[PDB]
Amino acid sequence: VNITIDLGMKLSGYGQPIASALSNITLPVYVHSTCKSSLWDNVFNSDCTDVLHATAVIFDVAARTRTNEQVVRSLY
Amino acid sequence: VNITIDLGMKLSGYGQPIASALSNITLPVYVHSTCKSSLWDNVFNSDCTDVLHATAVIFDVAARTRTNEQVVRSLY
Amino acid sequence: DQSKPWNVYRLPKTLIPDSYNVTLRPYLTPLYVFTGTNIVRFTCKESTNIVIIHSKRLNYTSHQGHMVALSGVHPQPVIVRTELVELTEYLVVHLQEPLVAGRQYEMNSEFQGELADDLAGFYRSEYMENGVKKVLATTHMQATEARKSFPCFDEPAMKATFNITIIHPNNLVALSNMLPRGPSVTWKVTEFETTPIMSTYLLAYIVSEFSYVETRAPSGVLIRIWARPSAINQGHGDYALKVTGPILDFFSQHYDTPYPLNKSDQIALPDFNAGAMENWGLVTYRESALLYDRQSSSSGNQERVVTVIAHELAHQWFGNLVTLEWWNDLWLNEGFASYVEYLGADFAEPTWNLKDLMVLNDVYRVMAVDALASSHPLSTPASEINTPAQISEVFDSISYSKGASVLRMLSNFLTEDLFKMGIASYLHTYKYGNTIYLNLWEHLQQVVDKQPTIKLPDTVSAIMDRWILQMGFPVITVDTQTGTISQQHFLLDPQSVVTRPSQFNYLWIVPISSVRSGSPQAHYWLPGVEKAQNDLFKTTANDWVLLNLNVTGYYLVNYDNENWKKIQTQLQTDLSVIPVINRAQVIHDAFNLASAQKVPVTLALNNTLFLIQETEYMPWQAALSSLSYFKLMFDRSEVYGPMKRYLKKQVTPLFNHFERVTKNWTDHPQTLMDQYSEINAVSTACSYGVPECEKLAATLFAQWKKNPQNNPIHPNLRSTVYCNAIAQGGEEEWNFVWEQFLKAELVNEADKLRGALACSNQVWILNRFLSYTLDPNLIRKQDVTSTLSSISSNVVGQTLVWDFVQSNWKKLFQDYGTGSFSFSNLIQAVTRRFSTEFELQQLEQFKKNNMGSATRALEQALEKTKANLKWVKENKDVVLRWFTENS
Amino acid sequence: DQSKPWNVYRLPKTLIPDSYNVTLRPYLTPLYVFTGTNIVRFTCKESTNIVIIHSKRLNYTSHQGHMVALSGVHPQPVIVRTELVELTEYLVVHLQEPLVAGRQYEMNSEFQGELADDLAGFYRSEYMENGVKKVLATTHMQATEARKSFPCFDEPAMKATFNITIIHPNNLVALSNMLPRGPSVTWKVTEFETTPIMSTYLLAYIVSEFSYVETRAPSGVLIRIWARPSAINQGHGDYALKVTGPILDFFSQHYDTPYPLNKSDQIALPDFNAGAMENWGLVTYRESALLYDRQSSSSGNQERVVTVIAHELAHQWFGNLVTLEWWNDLWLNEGFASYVEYLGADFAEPTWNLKDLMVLNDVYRVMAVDALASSHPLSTPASEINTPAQISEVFDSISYSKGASVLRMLSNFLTEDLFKMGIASYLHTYKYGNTIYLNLWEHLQQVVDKQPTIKLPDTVSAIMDRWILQMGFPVITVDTQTGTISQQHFLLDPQSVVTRPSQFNYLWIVPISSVRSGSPQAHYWLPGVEKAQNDLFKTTANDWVLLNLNVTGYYLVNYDNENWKKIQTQLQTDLSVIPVINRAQVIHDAFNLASAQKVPVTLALNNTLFLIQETEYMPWQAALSSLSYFKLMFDRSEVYGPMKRYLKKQVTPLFNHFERVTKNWTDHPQTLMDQYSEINAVSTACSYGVPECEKLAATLFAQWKKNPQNNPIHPNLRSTVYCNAIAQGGEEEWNFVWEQFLKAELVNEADKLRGALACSNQVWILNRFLSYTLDPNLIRKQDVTSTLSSISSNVVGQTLVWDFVQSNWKKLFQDYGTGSFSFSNLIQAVTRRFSTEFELQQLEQFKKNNMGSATRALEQALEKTKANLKWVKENKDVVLRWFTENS
Ligand SMILES: *[C@@H]1O[C@H](CO)[C@@H](O[C@@H]2O[C@H](CO)[C@@H](O)[C@H](O)[C@H]2NC(C)=O)[C@H](O)[C@H]1NC(C)=O
Ligand SMILES: *[C@@H]1O[C@H](CO)[C@@H](O[C@@H]2O[C@H](CO)[C@@H](O)[C@H](O)[C@H]2NC(C)=O)[C@H](O)[C@H]1NC(C)=O
Ligand SMILES: *[C@@H]1O[C@H](CO)[C@@H](O[C@@H]2O[C@H](CO)[C@@H](O)[C@H](O)[C@H]2NC(C)=O)[C@H](O)[C@H]1NC(C)=O
Ligand SMILES: *[C@@H]1O[C@H](CO)[C@@H](O[C@@H]2O[C@H](CO)[C@@H](O)[C@H](O)[C@H]2NC(C)=O)[C@H](O)[C@H]1NC(C)=O
Ligand SMILES: [Zn+2]
Ligand SMILES: [Zn+2]
């Protein structure tokens, strides 16, 4: 149904977008992706910028960035 | 007629192909381009490599490289 | 004149106190001073016509013509005279008639002292809060400083109850050992409940304006953490409160004795040079070691917090409930705490594997100073400590670290259960009393004799005599061709002469475990003879042995070359067979034996070849600690070329490993050991020119500089990133870091920035930094020497710092050589690269042109320079050949 | 005892030689020696009974009992005795009867000398060809060294014809001043034609195995270039042969006299420390200054070749055709050549604008040493030069550079046509004779008096007396508010005391040109008075003046502040109005006046603000030469921060300009000035951290390292690229450059690589280089000091080099202080950064602990250090403020 994925994105030490494993999935078949950025303290209180922008895709739920796709969680 | 252009190519101090103004044109309308490379001493005794490869194009006769075209001479 | 009893440093055994009534009234308004009144109730065990009581810098008020008044509890004594003896810090009262034995007497007095800025007795601490300056009144009365606050029998064996009363302004709050008796009613009076039977040096009371966070354990103990209101509001005291409870529960179960008191207050002070004091019921810390900030603190700070809390809470049973009879047994107290803190911490942090760090923190730290001919035994007769300076002399690193090591060894060869049973019996038998180490040995022997499982070659006291009565530790040499085993007194200097006699002729009774190709063997005892033979140490061409498992014994181990080669082959084949502690042990022992010219240095270098596949922290830490001397001796010569290369070759995989583990440095490990390993990997990779580490540091520094408000760099990596970015960059990075340092409010971040500022490769920048160090507005005085040492660590800054010190000798000596040991440490730190004859001649010329303690420091530097010159001349060619062949 | 004529250093005026017959037979087979026979024909002007003739280290053979034989051309003299006076280098023959006046006599002798390794007289030179060692026999008989080869009247005023004969192996060839008389017939005899009337010090003959390239001018002169056969085959002598002809034609037209001889041979020697010698018909050069390689030589080498050829070919008329009467007028000869070489070179290279470089090469080079109280005048009486050491003392930089400057000024204010006419008359009148400068002054005065156009304030000799009889030069101060003009003796030290008296009281008669806002004015003469007034120097609020046009006068110029501001505004508005030589002059004069505390240093710094839009070479060169002292004094302090920034801001456009002109560094300029400007731009941009220059250097070094066989880097940029790549990189670049240096066959490339090896920023690499300098197999002895100086130029290597020199003082003094001035230059080069009291105290302590010329060098270094300390303490704050405000 209306499945929502809250992705968490971080900027790596080399300056690359990395999809955090702390992303959340809600199952209360449209998919709604909400992106949140954070720092080393793992506090997702900032909206994602252009660089750290990913779309939730789908089994394994992954985050498609502008250059790659990274597996976040598994909906088993 | 059978116009031949002997282009002279050099590698710049930044590592870029530069078309030397010492290129030669012969008029004894097919165009035949022959590429020769050299060093700071201006001795075109080496065949052009892949990087320093240019094709003579056409008025002004120029040298089209893989990334740009540089005017070599003028056939006025 | 020892005939007069008031000329003897030891208090007479004629009068025994029972209870005290102390009333104090600090005057925080300035010439800061305090006034008070005191009542002492004592019993005369033997008839005497004189009363002697400790007193130090107290002005008394005349009472019927005399300083103090005396009465019975009635043949009232007549005070013929009363005087002060400043040499022995005494107050002598002469009575016209001898006191009747078996009768109790009360002495009243009224006195006025000073609240000075020296951390002794009842003093004052001035700090800066916001833009204002605030003053608090606190006590540090350890050892022989309770006499400075009120007249008392200031000896640990003199135990009495105390009734404390404080008079303080309404705007302040007062803390003591016990709970207040009720509400405090421009001045208020606070009274506290009667303390149990305790010693004078364990008392404390503090008047200040502080906030607290409180909790209650299921056992009913009220735990409070006190700090400045800002720190409490920011939540900097939450971790200490969280970990205090589990540690108290662990110590209650381990000692098999409930917590003796009802409350547990721990207070953090902005300025406390002592570090921590184990006052009964009111523990005092420095705020840099008790408060934890989850936004700017690294893992080392958290480990320090938990370990210091465990160490100070261990004293509540062992040290306060049962106290030492005299200051010559202090090693037994402190060392015990220094051993059990890890255990307590291991209970609070089960996943940190803290008990493995103790070796690196203690054993290897003390073996450096215990392997010298200038060492001293743990135990000395009580008659050799009478002067307060002699009393203060026993608080040294030997008493802590080596005491912890020997107690750990004793606990290991007696098993934990028997050790705990003996400790519990000892605590139960002598509660609210004083003891000597012989009583503990007797209790342990009683526990041992009641079980048939464990058998010892001799009694507990006989075994411990070898380890507490003579200095040093043995080296045990094993020949596996025949299985012969021998022991010898180990010294770092092969040409050293020991002039301190020993009653055992430097022979120990040694407990020895071992494995055979990873399979445990039977426990063995070296019986105190020079040589012996056994088949536990005889091997064929296939198997090998390794003795000191987990380094539970306080000795070094040496093998024959074939056994070393087999061990190296096993390390190159499968690391997991050999425990990680022993993997660090082989490196440490090989380097120490090479320094003593017992094995070639090439063997020590061969022992480091397995680090290319090692991901643990302790072997890397041991190897880097050993190779620091090589780096100091060879960083300005041709040997530095290959050596760096070799280290790079060794460190490239480890870094790569973490680069894969951390997901390009986004997620960081949660365990302490893995975090230490990651810090080591990043630091070593950036120090020896790995391009990925430099790129990481540059990118992180750029991210930080883009948004200085929020630091994107994890606190574990900040120092390495800052130093590497400054080293790679130029004036812009240095200026940015300097501007950040100037506006820094915290202490850890400011220290990290100041340390990073010394990594510059430009001569003019370093000279400008040296010029900055002369201004107190930019660099604080208490940091100046540290800064210099950091600038001395740079290979470019060695000559600059030496010239700066030579040019400013008088000012530096005046500012840091009056009563502090920081000047000697600065002199030692700036001369440790000297290994050439030209440098030796220059140092000798400087000494000749500069003729107190400065000359002694120069002489020690000259001796160290001569030793370094000899070592370099002896080892340069072979180490260069090895590094070229193995890089 | 001056009564005896053989104790007088000056030869008697009694005997005059007419012709010589010299026969020589070198023995290249080794104890190398040579033998010969000699015949001297002379006339006795006055009757005498003694014969004195120069002779130095010649073993004679007995002829009838005496060393030499004498006969008439017959009252045969009887030789009573013959002896050698070693002090005056004489051979004295005593005759029983006085010689008859008006009669000619012949003296025969047979002698045997040594072919030593010292470059004096007839000596030997040993060089390495391929893998073998070869020996040649050559002569350097300048000054007073022809007596060392054969007995002669060795004075320049003694002129005679010569007949030379050589006996040499068949495998060798022999060269002399004249053409051989015919074919040379295991030994061969070569005879040469009779020389014209010439002096003894101009003779030369060389026996060697050399090849030559020949050509014939349209005038009929055969021009030959001689060198080693390998160099001739490779074509390294083509440029010299090409340029020799045009220079000879120019000198034939300029002197208005044809070439006196028939052939012109120029020979390059592998080892010739003298540089070049102007032997008549056979000029000798060092191969590093005569041979040009079109594959590895830069533009500086080509300019040096053409200028040295012109300088040596100028002597064929002025110096050889007409010679000095005595060694006290040498400044007239050398200086003249030092002025005309550029002119000759300007004819050979019309597009190089060489005549503008002379200032930078000569005037500004000599004003540094002529502005000291220790200077000396150009002209001295002949009676003050008698000792050969005194004769050698006159060959100093003053005689060359200041002589060239004064002769250039004289030529400019007399116009070129009149100067050439006077020179031609002087050459025609005194051909094959000797002169003094008064004769040249008289000829110039005669030419001046024969024309009405040019008018002088006095005679030529009266004007030149002010410039040749007193030391120093004036500074001319102009006040434009009133038009007043004054002159003063200029000294660099404001607190210097001049103790050398002057007959003119240090007042000159000064020729002054000027422009008014770019418009020429009328020529003016300062008449030898301290102060004067004229309306040529009075300006309104709009116009400005500038005096020394093209710096044709040997003096400094100072203005009032308003005129300086107007000049600076004009420079910021339009550069083209002011000539480029004067654009360099303003900077040079401002800095020199600031050093003398006549103008504030801020004015000198303001004068450099126009360089941000300057694309010429001379102003940049002058500014960098002036700022080298600032860089030396401030490269280890806080002033180095802003200063570099400012220089970067000034150099960024110029670099960009050439980046656009050269088409990303592919096509390089063809004119000498543009090439110098490009070299300056690249060097300055890379030295002060311009990222584009660093990227260019890294890319070029990578291209070179990819294919070491062919060097893709243009020879003009090789030094900068190598040094910058080594500075940016690490051990790999340094090792590559070191390996290239070890296998280098040429000299210029090896020198460039060795200089680049000293740009490393690593302490251990620099220490390893210092260790390498101790091995003669790696670094040659003759380069060692130079290498040290280069390592001293690095700010990191200053302390390392100073410590190395202090540690190896004795060996360095033994190897380079025995008879060479290289040790003094090394001492001066390694101590020029000393500006602090600590460094001064250390230097004084070293001097006290090290007590010949070494102590004098240390004392001079102490004085320089004191001056530097005072200057830094006086200027640091203001220069820091200026650099911060203008960066
Ligand atoms: C300190 O205060 C305590 C009570 O807090 C006093 O102990 C009491 O003393 C009185 C008077 O001697 C006895 O009657 C009580 O039995 C004591 N209470 C007990 C034992 O619980 C103590 O004496 C005071 N100390 C002094 C006065 O020196
Ligand atoms: C350190 O290891 C090296 C390399 O294995 C050892 O040198 C070898 O020694 C064996 C004999 O045990 C020789 O057969 C090899 O040829 C040696 N290899 C070399 C020199 O490259 C060296 O002995 C070890 N050092 C010790 C044990 O001190
Ligand atoms: C040097 O050789 C020259 C010839 O090359 C000699 O000059 C000739 O000398 C003879 C003998 O006196 C005269 O008869 C000739 O007239 C001279 N030739 C001329 C003037 O052209 C010269 O005498 C020789 N020098 C000596 C012998 O000292
Ligand atoms: C160098 O140039 C500066 C900048 O122009 C001069 O300082 C100025 O002086 C004028 C007066 O002539 C003042 O009106 C300006 O305010 C000054 N500007 C500043 C200080 O920024 C300076 O005098 C010059 N130095 C000299 C001539 O020695
Ligand atoms: Zn403790
Ligand atoms: Zn000359």
Residue numbers in the entry:
A (entry chain B), B (entry chain D): 536 to 563, 581 to 610, 644 to 661
C (entry chain A), D (entry chain C): 64 to 93, 98 to 140, 144 to 255, 262 to 927, 932 to 967
Q: What do the authors report?
A:
FCoV-23 is a recently emerged, highly pathogenic recombinant coronavirus responsible for a widespread outbreak of feline infectious peritonitis. All coronaviruses are decorated with several copies of a homotrimeric spike (S) glycoprotein that is the target of neutralizing antibodies, drives viral entry through receptor binding and membrane fusion and contributes to pathogenesis. FCoV-23 S-long comprises an amino-terminal S1 subunit, folding as five domains designated 0 and A–D, and a C-terminal S2 subunit. Collectively, these findings identify APN as a bona fide entry receptor for FCoV-23, which seems to have broad receptor species tropism, mirroring that of CCoV-HuPn-2018.
We show that FCoV-23 can use several aminopeptidase N orthologues as receptors and reveal the molecular determinants of receptor species tropism, including a glycan that modulates human receptor engagement. We detected binding of dimeric Felis catus APN (FcAPN) and Canis lupus familiaris (CfAPN) ectodomain dimers fused to a human crystallizable fragment (Fc) fragment, but not human or Gallus gallus APN-Fc (GgAPN-Fc), to the immobilized FCoV-23 RBD, as was the case for CCoV-HuPn-2018. The apparent binding avidities (Kd,app) of FcAPN and CfAPN were 11 and 1.3 nM, respectively. To understand how FCoV-23 recognizes APN, we determined a cryo-EM structure of the complex between the FCoV-23 RBD and FcAPN at 2.5 Å resolution. In receptor-binding loop 2, W592FCoV-23 is packed against H790APN and P791APN, and its imino group is hydrogen-bonded to the main-chain carbonyl of N787APN. We note that the substitution of R540CCoV-HuPn-2018 with L546FCoV-23 abrogates a salt bridge formed with CfAPN(E786) (corresponding to FcAPN(Q779)). Transient transfection of a membrane-anchored human APN(N739) oligosaccharide knock-in mutant (R741T substitution) rendered cells permissive to FCoV-23 S VSV entry, which confirmed the importance of this glycan-mediated interaction for receptor engagement. Conversely, removal of this oligosaccharide from FcAPN (T742R substitution) reduced FCoV-23 S-mediated and CCoV-HuPn-2018 S-mediated entry into cells by two orders of magnitude, which further demonstrated its key role for binding.
